[PDB]
Ligand SMILES: *[C@@H]1O[C@H](CO)[C@@H](O[C@@H]2O[C@H](CO)[C@@H](O)[C@H](O)[C@H]2NC(C)=O)[C@H](O)[C@H]1NC(C)=O
């Protein structure tokens with residue numbers, strides 16, 4: 001009840017395993033990285 | 043945690059699967075006993 005202001009697209013989304021907002025997920029899809037040490041198993 | 047507090051230390055093998063230490067430069071192997079080995083994303 002924020003006076004008619006809608007923050008759903010920047011508030012966290014509980015459904016996703018990572019509680020990222022819609023815009024945060026959009027940004028993470030937009031940027032593609034090259035590894036971050038995700039425990040290389042050889 | 044600092045020498046004065048304790049001489050007990052923990053060793054982290056960065057980017058290594060925890061099974062690869064049983065699979066396996068450092069002469070000391072006194073930590074191969076394990077029983078408290080924890081596999082983190084760091085190693
Ligand atoms: C706040 O904005 C979101 C959309 O940005 C609204 O969510 C939509 O709601 C309608 C009907 O409930 C659905 O058809 C859409 O699919 C929804 N969009 C998304 C991304 O879920 C939301 O209803 C708005 N909140 C309020 C109180 O009006």
Ligand SMILES: *[C@@H]1O[C@H](CO)[C@@H](O)[C@H](O)[C@H]1NC(C)=O
Pocket residue numbers: 046047
């Ligand atoms: C911690 O190290 C300092 C050295 O500056 C020493 O004065 C202090 O006694 C040490 N603490 C204990 C419990 O030994």
Ligand SMILES: *[C@@H]1O[C@H](CO)[C@@H](O)[C@H](O)[C@H]1NC(C)=O
Pocket residue numbers: 039041059060061081
């Ligand atoms: C490490 O090894 C086991 C089997 O060798 C494997 O199941 C496990 O997923 C690997 N650990 C990680 C963090 O990926």
